[PDB]
Amino acid sequence: XXXXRXXX
Amino acid sequence: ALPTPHEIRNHLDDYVIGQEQAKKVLAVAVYNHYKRLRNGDTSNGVELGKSNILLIGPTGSGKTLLAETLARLLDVPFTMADATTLTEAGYVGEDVENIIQKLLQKSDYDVQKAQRGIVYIDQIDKISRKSDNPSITRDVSGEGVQQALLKLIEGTVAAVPPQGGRKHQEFLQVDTSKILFICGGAFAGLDKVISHRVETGSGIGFGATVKAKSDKASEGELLAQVEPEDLIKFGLIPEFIGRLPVVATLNELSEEALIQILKEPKNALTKQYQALFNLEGVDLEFRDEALDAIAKKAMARKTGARGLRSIVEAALLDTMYDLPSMEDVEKVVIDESVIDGQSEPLLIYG
Amino acid sequence: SALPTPHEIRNHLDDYVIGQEQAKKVLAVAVYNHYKRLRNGDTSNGVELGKSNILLIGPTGSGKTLLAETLARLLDVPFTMADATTLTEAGYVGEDVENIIQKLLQKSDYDVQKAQRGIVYIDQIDKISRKSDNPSITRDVSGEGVQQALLKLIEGTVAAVPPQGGRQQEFLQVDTSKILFICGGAFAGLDKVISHRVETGSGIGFGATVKAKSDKASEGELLAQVEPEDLIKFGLIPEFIGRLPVVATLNELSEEALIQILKEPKNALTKQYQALFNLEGVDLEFRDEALDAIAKKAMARKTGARGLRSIVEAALLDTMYDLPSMEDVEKVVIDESVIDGQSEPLLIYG
Numbered sequence A: 001x002x003x004x005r006x007x008x
Numbered sequence B: 001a002l003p004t005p006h007e008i009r010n011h012l013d014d015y016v017i018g019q020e021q022a023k024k025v026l027a028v029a030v031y032n033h034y035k036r037l038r039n040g041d042t043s044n045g046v047e048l049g050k051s052n053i054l055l056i057g058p059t060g061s062g063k064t065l066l067a068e069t070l071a072r073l074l075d076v077p078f079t080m081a082d083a084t085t086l087t088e089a090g091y092v093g094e095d096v097e098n099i100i101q102k103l104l105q106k107s108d109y110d111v112q113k114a115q116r117g118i119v120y121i122d123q124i125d126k127i128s129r130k131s132d133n134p135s136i137t138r139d140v141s142g143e144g145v146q147q148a149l150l151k152l153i154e155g156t157v158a159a160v161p162p163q164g165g166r167k168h169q170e171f172l173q174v175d176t177s178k179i180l181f182i183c184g185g186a187f188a189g190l191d192k193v194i195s196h197r198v199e200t201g202s203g204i205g206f207g208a209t210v211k212a213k214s215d216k217a218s219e220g221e222l223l224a225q226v227e228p229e230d231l232i233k234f235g236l237i238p239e240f241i242g243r244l245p246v247v248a249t250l251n252e253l254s255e256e257a258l259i260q261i262l263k264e265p266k267n268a269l270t271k272q273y274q275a276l277f278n279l280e281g282v283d284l285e286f287r288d289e290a291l292d293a294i295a296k297k298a299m300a301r302k303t304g305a306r307g308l309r310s311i312v313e314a315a316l317l318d319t320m321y322d323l324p325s326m327e328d329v330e331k332v333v334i335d336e337s338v339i340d341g342q343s344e345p346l347l348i349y350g
Numbered sequence C: 001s002a003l004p005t006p007h008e009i010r011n012h013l014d015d016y017v018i019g020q021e022q023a024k025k026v027l028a029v030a031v032y033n034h035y036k037r038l039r040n041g042d043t044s045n046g047v048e049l050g051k052s053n054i055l056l057i058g059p060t061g062s063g064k065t066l067l068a069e070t071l072a073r074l075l076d077v078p079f080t081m082a083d084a085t086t087l088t089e090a091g092y093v094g095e096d097v098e099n100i101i102q103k104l105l106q107k108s109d110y111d112v113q114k115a116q117r118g119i120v121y122i123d124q125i126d127k128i129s130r131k132s133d134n135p136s137i138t139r140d141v142s143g144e145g146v147q148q149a150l151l152k153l154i155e156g157t158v159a160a161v162p163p164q165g166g167r168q169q170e171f172l173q174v175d176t177s178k179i180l181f182i183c184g185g186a187f188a189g190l191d192k193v194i195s196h197r198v199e200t201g202s203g204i205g206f207g208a209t210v211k212a213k214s215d216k217a218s219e220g221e222l223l224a225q226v227e228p229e230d231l232i233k234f235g236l237i238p239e240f241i242g243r244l245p246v247v248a249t250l251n252e253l254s255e256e257a258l259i260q261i262l263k264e265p266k267n268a269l270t271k272q273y274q275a276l277f278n279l280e281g282v283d284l285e286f287r288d289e290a291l292d293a294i295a296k297k298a299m300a301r302k303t304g305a306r307g308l309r310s311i312v313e314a315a316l317l318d319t320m321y322d323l324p325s326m327e328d329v330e331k332v333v334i335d336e337s338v339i340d341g342q343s344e345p346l347l348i349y350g
């Protein structure tokens, strides 16, 4: 549904 | 008849101590909420305005305590939600609409009784933007939550699954222009922002002033000078703060206040432990010489009223560990020395 | 209906743990008092009875995780061991705080009234302690955010859990005001921050005193002097520490303590290898001269009790490799020289 993709 | 600010405040004083300005704001709001709904569709001054509340104070000041104690005396429905679990634009977490759904559980699906309810939110600081400028990338637990609440606070239609459903085929409409919202949260780091704005020194030379170490920016006196512009640098959006005109500035727990919190309230820790040993056939005592000494230890922790159990349980650890094994024990006395750790609590046998 | 006492439960944990008299007292008082708050059914004058969580702190391999494991055996009420390394701020892909609750219900057979009185344990809590300045630039999904989410879980709230994950789109509400939490994780680097508070000086000047190694702080003693303000520098939030007033500091292993770990506990490594060869029809022995040498080698590794198998298995590698092929061997003796490696372990023939 919702993708929480984050990279430091 | 209806209650009054003096009567509702007298009730909260039994459960809360040392918060004068905070009790006044909630009393006027609750006292005014009955007036707005009662005058709805009967007063010529139609489209009555609304005024939400934004509580602010240090940790362990009594924010979450006021919401619980208020439900005891409040007649209309009340709920206790949290900002941290909300998610904007229908993501993995719960949606804004879930807040209204929890209200119907306590209201028994009474829409006419749900619109006149009150709502409370805790830990509002968790959704604040980390930086002053808007985040370049999308945020799931920040600014976006504020955006979805704008139309909610002002007033908007909502979707609520009546029974046995999460999403789409039965929706109950519930307006929100008259629903009250009580947001609260201990904003961390706000003292640094106000100092730059208020002190304005920011210098090293002769003409620039260098405030003497440890005699400045007192949290109690600093929050009083707060303004909406200060929260913008914190991360909140002006559109969100505009929905909450009222602001309440609390104070840090005074040394004298902690002594009263353990004696005057009914749910004090001293009364709690007294009941813990009452079933054990053992009494308890707490002399004034020990209370005043505990206040200096608690304030050093800078944690608030909730950091008091560490001082008590650390002292009564040995005593509680051995009291059940002991027999013919009818009363326990804890003098001031016991708190410092240089002595052992005196025991009285039958 | 006679409940156990601290002296009785301490005898059980003493069989599995050694040299943790300070930590065992805390778990005994909490478990003891937990049944008292549970026993009450709102039939006492005291209301809103207090809660007291526990925060275990100790070196690596000192036995923190072992205390929680052995505790669940003798414990009647349910118990869990939820890893906190994988926890993520609610609203993100990685994980939610709710997952912890779901585990508790599997142990209690989905008994809400029986799960509310359960116990919860968390490991590796230092993994979420963010070490940084105020994070204006970025938002942490596993650091500061996770700790804030936990605050709502504690002190009282209502959450949502699927019915075994869902065969319905419905959830069950379970209060958590009465649920106890025992968070514990070896905080690495906590000694350096405490030293600044206790040493009080750099000592590059003429007047300032300098004791670089004569008065150097001992790690064991130093943790005893911990306080909540010290943890704020480490990364923890004051709001998080206020929920955990009690603190338990554990001492490092000692040469004398290591010898008792191999003999008194039933789950000792010495007894493990004794049973490993019992099925093979061979006896095992361990003389005291070998234990004293093993203790010195383990302390140098700076790993604790967990760094003991490397000393044993590295020595008995050659012996175990050719033990099955050998015949008529009924007993084995390990001398001090065997640990040093100068000689080989003597073998006996039946």
Ligand SMILES: Nc1ncnc2c1ncn2[C@@H]1O[C@H](COP(=O)(O)OP(=O)(O)OP(O)(O)=S)[C@@H](O)[C@H]1O
Pocket: B015, B016, B017, B018, B019, B057, B058, B059, B060, B061, B062, B063, B064, B065, B066, B123, B185, B186, B261, B265, B305, B306, C151, C239
């Ligand atoms: N004014 C007060 N009078 C008496 N006890 C208080 C008061 N304020 C706090 N306490 C004590 O502190 C406990 C916790 O109070 P809270 O309302 O949770 O403080 P808090 O500021 O809301 O914490 P937050 O918002 O999660 S940082 C209460 O259960 C009381 O025991």
Ligand SMILES: Nc1ncnc2c1ncn2[C@@H]1O[C@H](COP(=O)(O)OP(=O)(O)OP(O)(O)=S)[C@@H](O)[C@H]1O
Pocket: C016, C017, C018, C019, C020, C058, C059, C060, C061, C062, C063, C064, C065, C066, C067, C185, C186, C261, C265, C305, C306
């Ligand atoms: N007091 C003790 N007596 C006997 N064995 C112990 C003791 N403490 C630790 N051990 C051994 O160490 C193993 C692991 O102990 P742990 O509880 O994991 O230590 P720890 O402090 O939890 O390390 P962390 O926190 O997981 S890094 C146990 O399975 C035992 O074999």
